[PDB]
Amino acid sequence: MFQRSIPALITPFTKDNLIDEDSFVDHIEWQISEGSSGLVPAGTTGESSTLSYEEHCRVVELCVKTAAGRVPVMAGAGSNNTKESIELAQYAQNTGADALLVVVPYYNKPNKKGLLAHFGSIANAVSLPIYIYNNPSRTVIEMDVDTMAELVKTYSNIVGVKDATGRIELASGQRIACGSDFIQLSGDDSSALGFNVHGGVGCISVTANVAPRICAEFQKAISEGDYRQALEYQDKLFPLHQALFIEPSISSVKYALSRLGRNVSLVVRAPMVSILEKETMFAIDQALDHIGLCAG
Amino acid sequence: MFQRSIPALITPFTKDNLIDEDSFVDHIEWQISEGSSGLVPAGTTGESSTLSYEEHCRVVELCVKTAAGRVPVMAGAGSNNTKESIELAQYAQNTGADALLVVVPYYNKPNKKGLLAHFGSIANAVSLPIYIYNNPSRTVIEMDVDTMAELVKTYSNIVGVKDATGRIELASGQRIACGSDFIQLSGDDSSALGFNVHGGVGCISVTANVAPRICAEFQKAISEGDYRQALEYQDKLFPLHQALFIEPSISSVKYALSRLGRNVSLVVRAPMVSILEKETMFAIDQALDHIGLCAG
Amino acid sequence: MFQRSIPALITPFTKDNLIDEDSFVDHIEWQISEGSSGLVPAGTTGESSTLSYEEHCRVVELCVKTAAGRVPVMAGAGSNNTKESIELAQYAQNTGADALLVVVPYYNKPNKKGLLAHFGSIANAVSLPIYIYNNPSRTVIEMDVDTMAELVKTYSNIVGVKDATGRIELASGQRIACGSDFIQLSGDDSSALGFNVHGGVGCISVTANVAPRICAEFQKAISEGDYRQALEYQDKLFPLHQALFIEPSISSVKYALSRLGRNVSLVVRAPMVSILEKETMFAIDQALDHIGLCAG
Amino acid sequence: MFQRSIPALITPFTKDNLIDEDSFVDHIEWQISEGSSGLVPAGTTGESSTLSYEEHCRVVELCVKTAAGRVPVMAGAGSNNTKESIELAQYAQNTGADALLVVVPYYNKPNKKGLLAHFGSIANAVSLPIYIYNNPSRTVIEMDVDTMAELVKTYSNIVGVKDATGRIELASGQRIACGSDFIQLSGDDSSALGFNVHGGVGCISVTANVAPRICAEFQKAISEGDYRQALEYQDKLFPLHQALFIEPSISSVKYALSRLGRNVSLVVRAPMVSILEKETMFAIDQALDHIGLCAG
Ligand SMILES: N[C@@H](CCCC[NH3+])C(=O)O
Ligand SMILES: N[C@@H](CCCC[NH3+])C(=O)O
Ligand SMILES: N[C@@H](CCCC[NH3+])C(=O)O
Ligand SMILES: N[C@@H](CCCC[NH3+])C(=O)O
């Protein structure tokens, strides 16, 4: 259901700090037309941390309606509060999302029993498929392979992982412990190539916001087994992947999209800031031009 | 204003998962009569992550009202969303809190510019004194000493730090960069002793929830320069400091409080769980026995 | 020159703690006959830390003589003392090694200028090709991509890397910064598959000591672009890769070889110990049997 | 026996890269007359990694002879090769050293069983007191408190620790597990103050090479319980503690000594380099000026 290049969509804001709904709808249409295979609204890259409950729901709602069944929608339902996750998960189901992305809780650092209680409570509260989002670089704690396998064995609708660890040996361990039917998606653009050869089938991607067509061509080469061609795309994309997280990727992606002529403002919500260093903007501009993305 | 032993208060819940207001008031009264010198409600140990906005405000309001000016109240106003932090901070000011505890944003990983914008926006929106809560073991990012000093120089109401790093050399760096008028409080029970000899003046403490009198006597001896007696207290308290974070401190503290016979239920909110391993519970019982506070 | 499966050879010892030269010669012959493509004597897995200078030289000498030109020999010349590295490097050249493996210095933590002085002094002292061995999990410091590229640009005989980081995004960065002619070899068995699709051409391998034939078949599938078959081998090998470093791989490899009927004693040199926990031996035995390696 | 300020002595070299014996003797004499209470020759700050076996022994012999029983001598006998450690330890005993400093093995990463075998074998081969040097920032592995306590319980000549972790809570754990007769010495200049109030009795110090008198006055004030005066010294010394490890401490200390006008050349041994960045040198000059020891 979810495979190849799946953008973790930005949430564009107006000059007055409201949701820029027109810009968001335009962004989704453009992503679909350039070859993105699925959509993740209201995730980390969507600045879900700085959305209200109502805005978060509206972002998921708009994405589902705009996709109109052409591509599947995996709604962000991540929280460090299980009660809030269930409410976001039930909202997404009732509005027509195809699946849920649920991050390992951040800041309060549950132990293994807490991870089982968190993901099990969410799984019992909806019937949608659930992807575990494992990202210790943001959550500190890491779900281990034993816990992940127990959850897959216990709950039929825990079906996959967004693995942002960048340690691709874990993809082998997850494939063996959880089964080859467990759906593994890379959560790290720069290692998504090797992640797929270890058993992944796609990437929930930051860079796809900015370069959706090449990102899709890259994942298509992989799924066709043309790994020589996939490595050519990797060499082209790698500098952009890297330049987009010199500073926080939220503001770097919006900077790049604005520069490319997309109708996306630079506005982000504190504690993100839209001011980038000149050296950062230079690195992004050079990586964009290497790929050849400026229409002008 | 804030010195010696300051509990990071637990938030007790009823069996039906409401705030147990009677238990909370009783805990505060007991804390004050056993010698705690201040109170931090609705912090990390207070399970702020799983309180609603309404419940968070209620916990702060009820602490301020109960304390009634007897000891100063430093309200938790931490969030990874600057707008939410401003709203919690202004509610705490309006309800009568004496100061604010503001954690470095978690999960979304702002850069230094983002930290300046976050703490600056809060400082601009209230007149209360603000304490920076630096805890990279939960937030991943760490505020560095240049950033902390710049905030202190820029905003007269950024007055201190809760330093949970446990790396005591930072207390010297912060003392030199921010000045000796900068109020440093340990955020790490096990190294609070060394933190004060490097320039700290107290501890925002997990263990004080369970053993307020002995923690207060410990901080009193340091304040009086009786560091020989303080080491004796360190040796009695250290096993309990350590036993309370074998598993998450929230559940460990509430278990210890029930073991002491206080009117605190074991209920915590998911993703936290109240069930502790048998070996954890026995480690806590033995450390409590060692301070006589049970068996003897 | 170096490609596919290259064992980091153990150094077997007698009951009386001398070099077991017969066992070592037998091990090399067997490796060559099972398909290993190159040899690394007197590296980390060869217990180079506990060899005298004279033993180290003798191990390199024996390996070169035994290989007799059938496969190339990359002699370990690693030290945290540049003077010692030059002496080991010149010995290896003069005895007929085909190349050198030079680890980033351990324990004394040189800075970038020290890495340039170390690798440049060695490169100027021999004419053999040199592979940089980057392994921060043992050395703490990590050579960065800029330093590695500068060394490749400055010294024509610095030609490759054994990359033990297990972070395969670095293979993309090294390929771009150093060129596609820079020879990248995985130093991490469990991620060698994805390392090759990012641009690696082989693996200097711990596990190849124990399962040389499957390890060679695995690397041959990769070099033929049969990545579906390579993933089948990965699933078979991954449990063995992992079980061999539950405890130090030196003693785990020797345990496994002894169990398989090879003429290799369990003897290792302190601070390694040959005693393994029963759970470790069980995990190794199950992984060996899954692969089907016991002749009996 | 070992207390207060104990320099981890540099090893000066002549312009022709021999041991500068006259400079070494002069450094020791000066150290003793400025109030250092003990001496550690041929340690990490002594560049033990780049000394030959013969030179290492010579450095220990010359220190013992120069000291002449005036202050006790704790000889570096660290190696990652147990056999080498035994040989250095027995040479130090035979030449007249008073104790031994033995680092946790680096690079080859023994497990706990290996640590017991390493330190047990050394303890069995000498009658001198042995101090465990725990420094995971250089060795990666850390000896845990149960292992340290088991070694202390098992071997009567394992008497103390040089604890370079800088995590002061470990001093309390070691004090409780190993007993208050266990001799704890800070291995981290910047946190030595807090380490002693937690139970330490001195510091094996890098900074003492450069400022022996003030370091001795600092440790004297702690010994006398004048922790107010000790904090004043902390504030004067901390910028120099920090300036001496911007770049590797070896070269930084020798640069500071030349800046003071001592007869110490800048020569260090590769992979260390003597060239320091201009900003590093100025940070060192300013910190020296701040303790008046130059300009005033
Ligand atoms: N800032 C809070 C609330 C976000 C709620 C909507 N996603 C958090 O990151 O958990
Ligand atoms: N769970 C969210 C919202 C909590 C808001 C009330 N304290 C967070 O931890 O940021
Ligand atoms: N044990 C020392 C010497 C080994 C010399 C022969 N390889 C080291 O690891 O550097
Ligand atoms: N360089 C080797 C040998 C030094 C032997 C004399 N100290 C090591 O650091 O282990």
What is the C-alpha separation between C148 and C168, in angstroms, rounded? Answer: 16
What is the C-alpha separation between A173 and A184, in angstroms, rounded? Answer: 11
In the chain, the amino acid numbered A234 is Q
The CA distance from C178 to the nearest CA of chain D, in Å, is: 23
Beginning with the edge strand found earlier in the chain, give each strand of the sheet holding D74-76 in spatial order. Answer: D4-7, D202-205, D183-186, D158-163, D130-134, D99-103, D74-76
Convert C9-41 to b/e letters by CB count within 10 Å (16 or more is b). bbbbbeeeeebbeebbebbbeebbebbbbbbbb
Task: Count other Cβ atoms within 10 Å, centred on residue B218.
Answer: 29
Helix H or strand E segment including C136: helix C136-139
Judging contacts by C-beta atoms under 8 Å, the chain A residues touching residue B44 are 107-108
Q: List C-alpha distances in Å: D35 to A173, C206, D145.
A: 58, 52, 32
Residues B184 and B201: beta-carbon distance below 8 Å: yes
What is the C-alpha separation between B58 and B45, in angstroms, rounded? Answer: 16
What is the C-alpha separation between C32 and A279, in angstroms, rounded? Answer: 51
Q: What are phi and psi of C101, to 5 degrees?
A: -105, 120
E-only strand ranges, chain A? 4-7, 74-76, 99-103, 130-134, 158-163, 183-186, 202-205
Atom of ligand 3 nearest to the CA of D49: 10
What is the residue-wise DSSP string for D247-260? Answer: S-HHHHHHHHHHHT
Those chains having 3 or more beta-carbon pairs within 8 angstroms of chain B are A, D
The CA distance from A227 to the nearest CA of chain B, in Å, is: 34
What is the C-alpha separation between A195 and A193, in angstroms, rounded? Answer: 5
Strand duo A130-134 + A99-103: pairing: parallel
What is the C-alpha separation between A274 and A251, in angstroms, rounded? Answer: 5
The finding on whether C80 has its CB within 6 A of some atom of ligand 4 is yes
Residue A206 structural domain: 4-291
What is the C-alpha separation between A150 and A128, in angstroms, rounded? Answer: 19
Kindly give the distance from the C-alpha atom of residue C121 to the centroid of ligand 3, in angstroms, as a whole number: 19
Tell me the residue length of chain C. Answer: 296
Q: Is residue C81 part of a domain?
A: yes
Task: Count other Cβ atoms within 10 Å, centred on residue B149.
Answer: 17
Q: Is residue A244 part of a domain?
A: yes
Domains of chain D: total: 1
Helices C227-243 and C212-223 pack at an angle, to 10 degrees, of 150
In the chain, the amino acid numbered B38 is G
What is the C-alpha separation between D12 and C235, in angstroms, rounded? Answer: 55
Could B166 and D168 be called an inter-chain contact, meaning their C-beta atoms sit closer than 8 Å? yes
What is the C-alpha separation between B246 and B276, in angstroms, rounded? Answer: 10
Q: How far is CA B109 from the centre of its chain?
A: 22
Residue nearest to atom 9 of ligand 1 (CA): A49
> What separation, in Å, do the N-terminal and C-terminal C-alpha atoms of chain D show?
36
Q: List C-alpha distances in Å: C271 to C50, C268, C274.
A: 9, 9, 10
What is the C-alpha separation between A116 and A6, in angstroms, rounded? Answer: 27
Q: Is residue B68 part of a domain?
A: yes
Convert A215-250 to b/e letters by CB count within 10 Å (16 or more is b). bbbbbbbbeeeebeebbebbebbbbbbbbbbbbbbb
B96 burial (CB, 10 Å; 0-12 / 13-18 / 19+) is middle
> Interior CA angle at C283 toward C277 and C289, to 5°?
135
Which of B175, B178, B197 to mutate to test binding with chain D, by most D CBs within 10 Å of its CB? Answer: B197
Judging contacts by C-beta atoms under 8 Å, the chain A residues touching residue B81 are 49-50, 269-271
Residues B218 and B5: beta-carbon distance below 8 Å: yes
Could A191 and C228 be called an inter-chain contact, meaning their C-beta atoms sit closer than 8 Å? no
Interface check for A275 against chain B (CB to CB < 8 A): the answer is yes
Nearest Cβ partner for A194 among C197, C225, C228 = C197
In the chain, the amino acid numbered C102 is V
- C189 pairs with which residues across the strands? none
Q: Which approach determined this entry? A: X-ray
Task: Count other Cβ atoms within 10 Å, centred on residue B212.
Answer: 21
Among chain B residues, the shortest Cα distance to D168 is held by B191
What is the C-alpha separation between A198 and C143, in angstroms, rounded? Answer: 26
The finding on whether D53 has its CB within 6 A of some atom of ligand 4 is yes
Residues B171 and B200: beta-carbon distance below 8 Å: yes
- The residues in A 127-166 lying below 8 A from C, measured between CB atoms, are 166
Among chain D residues, the shortest Cα distance to B197 is held by D194
Residues B127 and B157: beta-carbon distance below 8 Å: yes
Q: CB neighbours of D77 closer than 8 A, spacing ≥ 6?
A: D85, D88, D89, D92, D100, D101, D102, D122
Convert D230-266 to b/e letters by CB count within 10 Å (16 or more is b). bbebbbbbbbbbbbbebbbbbbbbbbbbebeebebeb
Kindly give the distance from the C-alpha atom of residue B47 to the centroid of ligand 2, in angstroms, as a whole number: 9
What is the C-alpha separation between D278 and D275, in angstroms, rounded? Answer: 9
Evaluate whether chains D and A are touching (3 or more beta carbon pairs less than 8 Å apart): no
What is the C-alpha separation between B25 and D122, in angstroms, rounded? Answer: 59
**Helices marked H in D1-135 — which ranges?**
21-33, 53-67, 82-95, 112-125
Those chains having 3 or more beta-carbon pairs within 8 angstroms of chain C are A, D
Q: How far is CA B65 from the centre of its chain?
A: 19
Q: Residue D41 CA: which ligand is closest?
A: 4
Could A167 and C230 be called an inter-chain contact, meaning their C-beta atoms sit closer than 8 Å? no
Answer yes or no: is A158 a known binding residue. Answer: no
Residues B41 and B8: beta-carbon distance below 8 Å: no
What is the C-alpha separation between B115 and B118, in angstroms, rounded? Answer: 5
Atom of ligand 3 nearest to the CA of C81: 10
- C8 pairs with which residues across the strands? C40
> Interior CA angle at A33 toward A28 and A39, to 5°?
40
Q: CB neighbours of B69 closer than 8 A, spacing ≥ 6?
A: none
What is the C-alpha separation between A204 and A192, in angstroms, rounded? Answer: 9
> Interior CA angle at D83 toward D77 and D85, to 5°?
5
In the chain, the amino acid numbered C266 is L
What is the C-alpha separation between B195 and B208, in angstroms, rounded? Answer: 17
Judging contacts by C-beta atoms under 8 Å, the chain A residues touching residue C242 are 173
Among chain C residues, the shortest Cα distance to A199 is held by C231
- CATH number of the domain residue A112 falls in: 3.20.20.70
Q: How far is CA D35 from the centre of its chain?
A: 16
Q: CB neighbours of D241 closer than 8 A, spacing ≥ 6?
A: D189, D190, D206, D207
Judging contacts by C-beta atoms under 8 Å, the chain C residues touching residue A169 are 166, 188, 190-191, 238
- Residue whose tokens read 């050349």: D265
What is the C-alpha separation between D245 and D248, in angstroms, rounded? Answer: 5
- DSSP structural state of residue C104: P
The finding on whether D81 has its CB within 6 A of some atom of ligand 3 is yes
> Interior CA angle at B291 toward B290 and B296, to 5°?
80
Residues C92 and C77: beta-carbon distance below 8 Å: yes
- The residues in D 242-261 lying below 8 A from C, measured between CB atoms, are 247-248, 250
- Residue whose tokens read 């260090």: D268
Residues C193 and C177: beta-carbon distance below 8 Å: no
Helices B227-243 and B278-290 pack at an angle, to 10 degrees, of 160
Interface check for A223 against chain C (CB to CB < 8 A): the answer is no
What is the C-alpha separation between A233 and C235, in angstroms, rounded? Answer: 27
Q: Is residue C296 part of a domain?
A: no
Atom of ligand 2 nearest to the CA of B53: 6
- DSSP structural state of residue D106: P
Residues A172 and A195: beta-carbon distance below 8 Å: no
Answer yes or no: is A165 a known binding residue. Answer: no
- DSSP structural state of residue A208: G
A34 burial (CB, 10 Å; 0-12 / 13-18 / 19+) is middle
What is the C-alpha separation between C16 and C13, in angstroms, rounded? Answer: 8
The finding on whether D58 has its CB within 6 A of some atom of ligand 4 is no
HEC secondary structure over B77-120: CCCCCHHHHHHHHHHHHHHCCCEEEEECCCCCCCCHHHHHHHHH
Beginning with the edge strand found earlier in the chain, give each strand of the sheet holding B183-186 in spatial order. Answer: B4-7, B202-205, B183-186, B158-163, B130-134, B99-103, B74-76
Q: Is residue D78 part of a domain?
A: yes
Residues D36 and D7: beta-carbon distance below 8 Å: yes
Q: What share of chain B is helix, strand, coil (3-state, %, to 5)?
A: 50, 10, 40
Q: Which structure tokens are listed for D67?
A: 């000291």
Q: CB neighbours of D19 closer than 8 A, spacing ≥ 6?
A: D11, D12, D13, D55, D58, D59, D62
Strand duo D183-186 + D202-205: pairing: parallel
Q: Which structure tokens are listed for C249?
A: 């791989």
Q: CB neighbours of C106 closer than 8 A, spacing ≥ 6?
A: C80, C138, C139, C140, D106, D107
Atom of ligand 4 nearest to the CA of D106: 10
Atom of ligand 1 nearest to the CA of A84: 5
> What separation, in Å, do the N-terminal and C-terminal C-alpha atoms of chain B show?
36
Using CA atoms of D42, D43, D47, D52 in order, give the dihedral in degrees to the nearest 10: 50
- D205 pairs with which residues across the strands? D7
- A76 pairs with which residues across the strands? A101
Across chain B, how many H-helices and E-strands are there? 12, 7
In the chain, the amino acid numbered A214 is I
- Cα atoms in the Cβ-side hemisphere of radius 13 Å centred on B122: 39
Helix H or strand E segment including C279: helix C278-291
Could C108 and D270 be called an inter-chain contact, meaning their C-beta atoms sit closer than 8 Å? no
Residues C95 and C82: beta-carbon distance below 8 Å: no
- Residue whose tokens read 């043992």: C138
> Interior CA angle at B140 toward B134 and B144, to 5°?
45
> Interior CA angle at B122 toward B59 and B138, to 5°?
65
Q: Which structure tokens are listed for B256?
A: 């210890």
- D134 pairs with which residues across the strands? D163
Q: How far is CA C294 from the centre of its chain?
A: 24
Comparing CA positions, the residue from C268, C276, C253 lying closest to residue C19 is C268
Kindly give the distance from the C-alpha atom of residue D80 to the centroid of ligand 3, in angstroms, as a whole number: 8
Q: Which structure tokens are listed for B60?
A: 């702060």
Task: Count other Cβ atoms within 10 Å, centred on residue C93.
Answer: 18
Q: What are phi and psi of B123, to 5 degrees?
A: -55, -35
What is the C-alpha separation between B288 and B211, in angstroms, rounded? Answer: 9
Interface check for C175 against chain A (CB to CB < 8 A): the answer is yes
Comparing CA positions, the residue from A24, A82, A23, A11 lying closest to residue A51 is A11
Q: Which structure tokens are listed for A223?
A: 């799924």
Q: What are phi and psi of C235, to 5 degrees?
A: -60, -35
Q: List C-alpha distances in Å: B249 to B238, B293, C116.
A: 15, 19, 47
Could B195 and D194 be called an inter-chain contact, meaning their C-beta atoms sit closer than 8 Å? yes
Residues A271 and A233: beta-carbon distance below 8 Å: no
Comparing CA positions, the residue from B46, B44, B40 lying closest to residue B103 is B44
What is the C-alpha separation between A243 and A168, in angstroms, rounded? Answer: 21
